[PDB]
């Protein structure tokens, strides 16, 4: 179980593609309406970490939460028929099953999952809780509409021989999504989030943009990862100014940004040397 507080400043961008796209709006990434800054949900990073763990582990005591056919009720029923089948008086039986799943699953240990379906077994508050990403420069939506020379269903097929199904494939030129996140210790002591799991989560956050790739997302990479390791479980200084110390603004006289040569990540670690640490894993 970990005992220190970690305030990591995850920074990641996108070369050309659709990172965290919005089902609410067709196929465009989440962008700020009033300004234009791109937004990326934390569930995308969580799924990238899960895929990295699935491809760089394959062992027990670190379940990865299977895809599609993985019914949550079936997994809950399978985890219930272990040490606390019935002889535990429902109440503490749920807590025992939750502890067993935390010791067995890695997704529920690092983040969390819903285990209150049919056979209830409590819920996990979760230690590490990432936030929604947000860029600084107002990004623009390119919208790269592409075509296909093969129809899907015969009903929507044309009355001729030219069977085409176009559509749109949105893309993004740039946008350093300044992600945020905080890690607690009280819930980590209950879920069993040890330091080895924390190091594995850091390695996943660092090297998830090298394997989890597709045609819609294109090419994505992680810039830097400045973790603010504390000293105790108390609160020294508000995290607002702590995360504001690593500001990311524009460089010289430029309108937009295209790569890392147009951003100036101002890192001035001067007032955060009281009872806090600093490490660089991605940058």
């Amino acid at each position: 179980t970990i005992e220190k507080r970690y305030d990591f400043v995850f920074l990641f961008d996108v070369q050309d593609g659709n990172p965290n796209g919005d089902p609410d709006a067709g196929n465009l990434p989440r962008i700020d309406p009033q300004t234009g800054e791109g937004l990326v949900t934390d569930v995308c990073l969580k799924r990238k970490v899960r895929n990295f763990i699935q491809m760089t582990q394959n062992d027990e005591h670190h379940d990865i939460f299977i895809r599609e056919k993985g019914i949550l009720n079936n997994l809950i029923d399978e985890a219930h028929e272990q040490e606390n089948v019935k002889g535990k008086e429902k109440g503490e039986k749920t807590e025992a099953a939750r502890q067993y799943m935390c010791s067995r699953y890695y997704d529920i240990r690092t983040f969390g999952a819903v285990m209150t379906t049919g056979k209830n077994a409590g819920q996990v508050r979760g230690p590490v809780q990432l936030t929604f990403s947000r860029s600084i420069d107002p990004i623009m939506t390119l919208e790269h509409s592409i075509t296909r020379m093969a129809v899907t269903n015969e009903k929507d097929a044309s009355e001729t021989g030219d069977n085409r199904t176009m559509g749109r494939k949105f893309t993004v030129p740039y946008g350093l999504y300044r992600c945020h996140g905080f890690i607690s210790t009280h819930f980590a002591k209950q879920t069993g989030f040890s330091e080895n799991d924390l190091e594995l989560f850091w390695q996943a956050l660092v090297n998830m943009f090298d394997h989890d790739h597709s045609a819609a997302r294109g090419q994505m990479n992680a810039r830097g990862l400045y973790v603010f390791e504390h000293s105790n479980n108390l609160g020294d200084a508000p995290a607002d100014s702590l995360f504001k110390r690593i500001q990311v603004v524009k460089k010289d006289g430029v309108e937009v940004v295209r790569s890392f040569d147009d951003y100036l990540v101002s890192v001035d670690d001067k007032n955060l040397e009281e009872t806090k640490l600093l490490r660089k894993l991605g940058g």
């Binding site: 962008i31 700020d32 309406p33 234009g36 107002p138 623009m140 939506t141 390119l142 919208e143 509409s145 309108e255 937009v256």
Partner: protein, 124 residues
């Protein structure tokens, strides 16, 4: 329902695309695929790539018209729109992305009318 003194880049860009589409439609009634069926897909995002070919094809579309005074009126309203368009931007903001289509359909409605465009042209 059209604001010609909004001083918005998206408004004038949409109005310009609308009058371009109107000119292309007036050039030939039996038109299958107009510019809106291909040029509008990236007009509000990459205007500097589509509006160049648009202005290149505009004089030929005006010469294709059977009436020469109609082309004169269309160029006059084109320039009255582009008065507030000090420059063609690289990419439009979300608000400007919406104002593009706003001005487009506003200018299309203002053009497809009985006595309106000619009435505004007479006071010039």
């Amino acid at each position: 329902g059209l604001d010609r003194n909004r001083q918005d880049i998206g408004y004038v860009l949409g109005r310009l695309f609308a009058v371009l589409e109107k000119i292309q439609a007036e050039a030939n009634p039996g038109l299958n695929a107009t510019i809106a069926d291909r040029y509008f897909g990236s007009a509000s995002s990459t205007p500097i790539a589509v509006f160049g070919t648009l202005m290149r094809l505009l004089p030929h579309h005006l010469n294709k018209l059977e009436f020469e005074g109609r082309a004169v009126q269309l160029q006059w309203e084109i320039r009255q729109i582009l008065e507030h368009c000090q420059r063609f931007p690289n990419h439009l903001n979300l608000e400007q992305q919406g104002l593009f289509a706003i001005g487009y359909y506003h200018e299309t409605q203002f053009l497809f009318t009985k006595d309106a465009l000619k009435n505004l042209f007479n006071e010039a």
